[PDB]
Design a protein around this nucleic acid. Sequence first.
DNA 1: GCGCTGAGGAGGTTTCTCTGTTAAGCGA
DNA 2: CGCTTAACAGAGAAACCTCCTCAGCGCT
Length: 255
Amino acid sequence: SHMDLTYAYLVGLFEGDGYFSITKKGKYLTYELGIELSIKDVQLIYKIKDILGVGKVSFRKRNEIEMVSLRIRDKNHLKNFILPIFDKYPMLSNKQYDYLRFKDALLSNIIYSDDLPEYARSNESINSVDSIINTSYFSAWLVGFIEAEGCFSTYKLNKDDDYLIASFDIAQKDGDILISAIHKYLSFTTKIYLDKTNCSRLKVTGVRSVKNVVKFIQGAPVKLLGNKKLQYKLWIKQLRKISRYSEKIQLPSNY
DNA sequence: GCGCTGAGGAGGTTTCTCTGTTAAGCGA
DNA sequence: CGCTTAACAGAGAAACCTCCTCAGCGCT
Ligand SMILES: [Ca+2]
Ligand SMILES: [Ca+2]
Ligand SMILES: [Ca+2]
């Protein structure tokens, strides 16, 4: 407790799906920390807000798409509750700069739009693969980050067959270091693919990798919370039907 | 009354996620 | 051969990040 390990889960989850933003408001400035998910996670925004004790929740539907936000902008609530979290549990991607800049500005009582210095994320990495795996909270943080950015899919090759394939995938923009640390923490061997938009994309599909993914969510000191838990659990079940997996990996159903 | 504020509402954009397809590993 | 994985990657929804107007509130 204090900032009990579930607080790491959070910074992970925000790092992937959230954002620390200071925005114009005429003469004035707003400081948002917001997360904005698909409507599918209504249940979890309220979880996060329950955990945190702050922020306003809103719903939004643009064209066919229903979305939900938790948004924290009260600057007294940022100072007292949010900053000791990300100070306690700092982020691990290069978003850290977003936070640092933001904290700094907030703490200097910058209220006027024209006072605000021009900012732009350092492209330089702020961190080393090594410092990452060695990061005591990291265990916890990785559940959070997987809530946001991980993807447990199973799918069938070939279109015209019974043969399934059971996968885990995660990705970052300008996240070669971060992706590499995860990839190394879980003892993968596959290529981290690097795409046209500098997206660094991890994907594994073997039995031994998967045996490991499963291993990790199972041993990790915090559970998934949102739609992801659901996603995980169905995939588990799924894995019990494909033979290569079912025969090497302890496959519980009490997650 | 004045200056500042968070909530509310919205636009602009792109980073993912999720599900493959093709070809090559490999146990045998 | 035949079960298994590795590399590549489209596409478009689920994120990411912004700016504005408004009432209310606590100052002097
Ligand atoms: Ca994300
Ligand atoms: Ca992200
Ligand atoms: Ca997500």
